Ligand binder design. Sequence first.
Ligand code: CA
Ligand code: CA
Ligand code: CA
Ligand code: CA
Ligand code: ZN
Lengths: 723, 114, 523, 523
Amino acid sequence: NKTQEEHLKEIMKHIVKIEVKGEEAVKKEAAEKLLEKVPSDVLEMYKAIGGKIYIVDGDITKHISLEALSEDKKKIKDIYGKDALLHEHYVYAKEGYEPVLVIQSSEDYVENTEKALNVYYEIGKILSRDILSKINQPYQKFLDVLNTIKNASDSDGQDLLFTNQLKEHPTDFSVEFLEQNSNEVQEVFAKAFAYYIEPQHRDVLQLYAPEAFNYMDKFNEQEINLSLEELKDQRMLSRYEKWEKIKQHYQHWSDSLSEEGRGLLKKLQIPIEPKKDDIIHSLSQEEKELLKRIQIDSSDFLSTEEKEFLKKLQIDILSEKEKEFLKKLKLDIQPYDINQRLQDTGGLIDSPSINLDVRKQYKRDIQNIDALLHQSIGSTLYNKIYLYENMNINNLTATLGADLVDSTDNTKINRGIFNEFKKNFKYSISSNYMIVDINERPALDNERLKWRIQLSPDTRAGYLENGKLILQRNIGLEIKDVQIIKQSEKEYIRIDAKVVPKSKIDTKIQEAQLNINQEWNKALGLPKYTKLITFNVHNRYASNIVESAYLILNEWKNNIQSDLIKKVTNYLVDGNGRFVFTDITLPNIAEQYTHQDEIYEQVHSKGLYVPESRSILLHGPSKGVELRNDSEGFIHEFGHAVDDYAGYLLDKNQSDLVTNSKKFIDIFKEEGSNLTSYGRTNEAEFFAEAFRLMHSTDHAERLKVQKNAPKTFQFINDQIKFI
Amino acid sequence: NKTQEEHLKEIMKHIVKIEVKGEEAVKKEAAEKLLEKVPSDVLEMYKAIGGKIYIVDGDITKHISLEALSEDKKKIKDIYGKDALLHEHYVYAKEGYEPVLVIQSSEDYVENTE
Amino acid sequence: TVPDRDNDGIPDSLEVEGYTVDVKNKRTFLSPWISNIHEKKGLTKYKSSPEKWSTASDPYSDFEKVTGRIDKNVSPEARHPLVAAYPIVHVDMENIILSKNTRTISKNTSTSRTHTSSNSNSSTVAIDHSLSTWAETMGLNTADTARLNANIRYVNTGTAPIYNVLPTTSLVLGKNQTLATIKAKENQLSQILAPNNYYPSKNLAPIALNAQDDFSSTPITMNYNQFLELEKTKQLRLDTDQVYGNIATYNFENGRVRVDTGSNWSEVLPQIQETTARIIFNGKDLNLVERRIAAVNPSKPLETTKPDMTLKEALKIAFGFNEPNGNLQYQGKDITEFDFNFDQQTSQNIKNQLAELNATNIYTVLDKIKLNAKMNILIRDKRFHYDRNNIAVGADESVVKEAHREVINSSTEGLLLNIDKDIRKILSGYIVEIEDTEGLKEVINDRYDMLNISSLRQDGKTFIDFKKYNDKLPLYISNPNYKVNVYAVTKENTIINPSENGDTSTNGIKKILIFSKKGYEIG
Amino acid sequence: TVPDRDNDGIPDSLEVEGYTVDVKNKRTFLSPWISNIHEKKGLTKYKSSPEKWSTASDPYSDFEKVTGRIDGNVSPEANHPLVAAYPIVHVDMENIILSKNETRTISKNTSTSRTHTSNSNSSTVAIDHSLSTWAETMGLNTADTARLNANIRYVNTGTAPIYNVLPTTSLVLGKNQTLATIKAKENQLSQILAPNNYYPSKNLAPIALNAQDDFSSTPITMNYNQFLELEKTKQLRLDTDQVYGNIATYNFENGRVRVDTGSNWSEVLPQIQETTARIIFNGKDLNLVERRIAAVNPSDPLETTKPDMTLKEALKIAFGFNEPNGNLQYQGKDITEFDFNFDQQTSQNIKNQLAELNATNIYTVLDKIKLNAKMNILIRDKRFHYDRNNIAVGADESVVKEAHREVINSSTEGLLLNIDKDIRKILSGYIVEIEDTEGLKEVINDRYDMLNISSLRQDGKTFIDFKKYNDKLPLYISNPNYKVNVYAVTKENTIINPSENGDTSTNGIKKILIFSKKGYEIG
Ligand SMILES: [Ca+2]
Ligand SMILES: [Ca+2]
Ligand SMILES: [Ca+2]
Ligand SMILES: [Ca+2]
Ligand SMILES: [Zn+2]
């Protein structure tokens, strides 16, 4: 316990002094103790935009740089909204193209909260009005903060951070309001910065308005360094000094290059296009006569470019046994692309879904590229490195790739689809080769996603001369923040990521797999160790494919009664069933080439039922030609599963499906011509289409099958009677 | 020596709770706290001879895999030699070539010995 | 790492956001309030204050009140955190004898706990005046000095027990003449006086002032003027103070409850009386029952951290009102039958809270009225009249007739009927007259002190006795044409002395007939 | 971290710049003063001293005053850190009874009041001199000896309770003739004396000097000359010391408030009296109220570190002045109705501060006048005339006549009219006379002590009685043309003895005409 002479020692430690430095040295040291609390980043940015820090004495209107101010600008309202005059006040900041910070010096900045609070308010007003208004900030993130503040239950944040004009605004805050009232948003950001910096009021700003506290805390931790580097991006000499340091560091690996390495890098840049005479001379037989007479614009297996290439090959010289030659000649005209092979395989370059020596040439060239990419990044010439990428949305998803951008003006982002995008985009896995940039270049018209990669100390890469860099294979990326920016009046998406090893991301996916298996055995009544859901995921949009499985299976659960679910899933558990929710290509998850007969008979589409092993696939990025979302794709494949299980309940030694019986082919020729065009190809697709549309979300699509095919409705409701 | 507010702290450590997970999460975690004590080897062997571990709710004769049991096999004697009925009891094991372990789930497996 | 400011043992978020105490597999289990589970079982939603070790400022903590780790004598409606637990003791005087310092007068007194228009507990002793002049009967001249002697029983009505120390009661005659001072014998009796019990209990001997075996008790004496004032008023008054001894605490090491020498009731009563709102009520058995409920005090920053207390919830947690089908009631008795009395400050406050809500009728807005600390509310039964002491001392003629209206026997010998135990507290007797049709009335026991003909019966139904004071002979009418009238006298109309003219007649007694029959076969 | 020089719980920059206690979701939070929120809620901007554990040198700290962790009996204007909490006890004597040491006895009802002349407190008893020679009634010789007896009550007007101890009171006749010394029996009574309450409180019996119970206390006796002077002056004088006993303090581990034996009032009162500025005020109901506000003493380095206290802010935090529309006023009563009396040194200081500011009207510059410690300010009311003890004993004739403007029920039985409660205090009696049309005036109570004809009625008004000294008969109006004057006298004009010539008549008594009406239906 403390005795009394110890209290004498504490109170003399606060009271007694030994050295007095006069006036002006303490005047100088009080000002630096004032400016020590501010992050150094905004001082460096105020240094870079052309600002001067003037610690003066006496009056502040008597300084030279504030001489030409009018009578009107000398009426200043402080942090609390009350009146002041500039010959009475002590800090003013000059606006425009040459800003000036003027601070009256005194010994009252060391202990007081008020004067230091007003100084940090003026510094925050500089930050909101000058630095951030050169990269078009504040923006939609801070508008979400503002609408969270003014739609609260309690009315203390509105009193603390808003003026009277922002109170009486009856609706919410749109981006029009940030356009034509940007100075009010600047005042609000300044006031939040002021209450966050001064360490007496930090707990008060946490208590009265917590969301502004979270915003400013995450801002002063990460976004201020990111914004300083993006402000240096607007300047050219910083770009070329970063260019200089990267070229000097990566000089010796470009000095240790051979001709074969440069040829491999250039063949990794562009696809090796196929030539046409080597295609035509390859046949020379009856095969030329099968290529010569053919319905070009009738078969639905090849794309537009591929049918045009075959139309180009007719001038270089049918749903029957000729189209197998089309399946075989689909892979024959595809360019030698390393990126497409790495993008489609998902790490298994031994997947035998293409030709033999082409697979071997792929594998040897990929091992050559990975063996040449051996140089680490860990160096002493630089601090944190910010490497960019412009990427298309269609490389991640085709479900949101069309409705991301609004239809009225194509320079906006639709906010509902943006929140659907933002909801579960937590991480990323880079299997293919990220050809990244050193500095910023503007994007192509299809590419609104503007990545920004922060590296690792163990990043392995190689250098190119034209202003690019390439990353290696199997890199883990954990997403930090996804926000809408504006650049040159075109609204975009900015995405940050942070490099992690692959084992953490696959550990997360293993944990999520075990959790979804426990939950959907618990909801279906199945054995403890059954593996019914699995994830073979390796691509960039991994997290949303992991998270969207829950919505897919719940929507399949809600659209069908529970008895058919239980019975057909019991059949699938008996037949080694899975529900592969993957985002890699369909012939490469190894539930499908372990039962097919030919390589060119492989299938790539939305959902797929493997008849021998009783599996249901799904594809992540790709969107169906018919479907509206993936949940109808899962019901669409559960249709084929019900077809197989009904084919087993006619005879346990006979045909696999109930639609191959001739007791449904008559109904398929009677009522198979009143519904959508996808099922019209043959009987099984109409079967799955009827089973998809009978269990719709809204009941009117269920009632269309009631009105158009009533006997098929009665037959399908007799096919549920198999229990 | 222990003073009295330390006994207040021990008894509040046994009494007070902060988070309640509903019913079914505690139902799930009670069953895994039941099966944590068994050696993993007999679970792996029961996995290898073709057995299924079914943690169910409600009645245990109402499950599908115990549907075809006769009237005679629903008279079970427990550990102490006394009588029980399968719609009153809570665990049965099915004999033969495809064995099945059926456990009624509850929050009574965490503290009880019986 | 768990936030706990008040050191009572419950975390903060539990206390602001609701918590409840459940017993599951024979083990206590405290947990947050989750409505879809806990509404079905019938558990109680508790709230309290995060910065007070006890919300109502009584020496039992919040944890010890909600979980049961308390001295078990504490009443069941004080196990809630918001109801204050503290003793309320007054003195019950059974019977008195006046002797001259046979020729001594012996009466049976009926005392009651009073509340006039906070400190101390007063009770008003009413001496019986019926048949057994007092100055003649004791034989007293002018220069006499009388002697007083009586039997008392200390009676608790509070919510917390008293250990070993009884209070010190003053005996006041009239307005402010102190007669004597009653103190505790032997300075320690080693007893317990629980809630709702008598010391000494109902099957022992009462404590006698100036006892037989004691001799060192000072004689309680009077002079002549005080003796005449005691005869002309028939009233005393007992003013009891608040020394209540120590507090029993709970030992967390081995479940033992013992009297703690370092904790005292005299240092926790003036906080209960400063932070809580008092609601006095007499609907159960027409006695003034005092309770205190914890409430906010707006100008104190550690008092606005109490839970928000309405008046509906205050009645529910203190007195056991319930709403079975939306009507808030007290064991069938509905609250449109009770009036609300206030004192002046809380009257102004309730008028402001009513003028705020645009409401005029208080009985429909009870879940919207918020209580604050230092309020005072008195809830009385509508059917009765009250005097200055707020003792039930009268009723209207209609309810007396309609309560006596279900008559069982009516003849020339008496009257037997069923009578309620609320109406038996306001009647001082019965008399029967015969009124002639030309206008001649005939009162049969024409004195102010022959009224006590009624006697409580082992059946519970009292028999009005016509025999006892008619020279033990019943009533013979000469003509059944003119009527027989029997009437009860109610305690605000009962006269206790002759007038200045020495009148002993029946005129001046304002009548309330319980009987109206023409005398013949009808009755 | 954050510097804390005094270890009271509040940091320094908050204590110099303004801090306040806010509650958000039922948790006490100590905040810097942010004026754009805290004026809308109605919170208060406190300020205190960085280097004192209590700013006004009273036993309660700064943090325990601003947060409510304080003894609950402390008055609400002593919760501010700049207002000192300390008890002020004087003695209230209700009646006196004079008797001969063996009818021959006297029983009069007295009216006492607290005085302040030009640190210790006292009170002055004015024995009522009207009807109901003292030596003739008592029958006293020159060889006599008198016995004095009375009923007293201790009254507190301070801002802190006193636990278990009562002061030691001397009784003074004339100037320095001590008749008796009053002490509290048994030395520890287990009582409480809250601010603005009595002991024993108004619904119990008063303390009697040498009561009917005890005998062994000292009989109060006088000789013949003391009885002569007491018949002359009608005025005793009580003097009270300052032994107030121990202090109730707070505990943080369980919230209990207990009498700590290691802390005493008699060693903390001579710090409050040395570091504060005392303001006396009687605008409430003409009784003197004393408060002490902490102020800056310029020559002491730990006393210049208090906040600066203007006289406006001192009146606001002490007495509940507020300014609704600029004019600072006290419940409508504007401050131009109030004087300012100073003692010598602070009059010198106020005159130097007014000469510095080049202003002459003190009522317009109250926000610029700074208070220093060790001042004495007396703020009285302008309407009345005050005697040597700052007690209202006189008035001007305008308000005395305007008190009797509002008439209710005039007749010849008396006058019943609505009169103000402030103007009842200065008036001592009424004179009632009959004037003919011809010019003769006949006073109907022709003595100096038959003037007590007014009497308050418990609804809140007074009823003048005409029958009271006319042999209980109504007013004889033979010819209703001529009129009856009934009018009043003030205490500075009232005679309290027979004259030196022996004149008992009403001549020589100054008078204010309040009433003359015709006699018929108007009156
Ligand atoms: Ca607590
Ligand atoms: Ca608590
Ligand atoms: Ca301090
Ligand atoms: Ca302080
Ligand atoms: Zn199709």
